Amino acid sequence: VTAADITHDGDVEIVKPQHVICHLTDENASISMRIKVQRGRGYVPASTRIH
DNA sequence: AATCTATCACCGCAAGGGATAAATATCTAACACCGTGCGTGTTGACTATTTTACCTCTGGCGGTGATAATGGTTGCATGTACTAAGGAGGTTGT
Numbered sequence: 001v002t003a004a005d006i007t008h009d010g011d012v013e014i015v016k017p018q019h020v021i022c023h024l025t026d027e028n029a030s031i032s033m034r035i036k037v038q039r040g041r042g043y044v045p046a047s048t049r050i051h
Numbered sequence: 052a053a054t055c056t057a058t059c060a061c062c063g064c065a066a067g068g069g070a071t072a073a074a075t076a077t078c079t080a081a082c083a084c085c086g087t088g089c090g091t092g093t094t095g096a097c098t099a100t101t102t103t104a105c106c107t108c109t110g111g112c113g114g115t116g117a118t119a120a121t122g123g124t125t126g127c128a129t130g131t132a133c134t135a136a137g138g139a140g141g142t143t144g145t
Binding site: 013015 | 056057058
């Protein structure tokens with residue numbers, strides 16, 4: 001599961017093709033997800049975003 | 052190894068800061084003069100440069116004293132821990 005398996009739900013370049021995520025094994029297998037992405041320029045903890 | 056779109060940004064290209072070099076004006080230094088005085092020259096009399104001679108220093112070193120003096124000094128090698136060797140000699144054994 002790879003960059004060649006993405007779809008662009010927004011404005012996103014991808015200078016990370018080699019970032020393989022996971023795998024599948026059968027001729028009828030599947031997996032799907034959404035992903036949220038951000039740029040900003042500073043840091044906050046995942047469970048101290050607070051408001 | 053070529054293609055570019057789409058990053059994070061350098062260029063795209065306006066502004067303005069310091070710089071340095073021109074001209075001026077000041078500084079000092081380099082010099083040319085002058086004057087001083089010293090180390091320019093020969094000569095001469097001095098006195099003590101050196102030599103040798105003489106008369107008489109310093110220090111070379113050889114020589115050995117006598118009322119008599121006639122049993123001496125010397126202090127700590129080391130105190131432990133080992134144990135291998137030689138030394139002893141009587142004897143109960145080879």
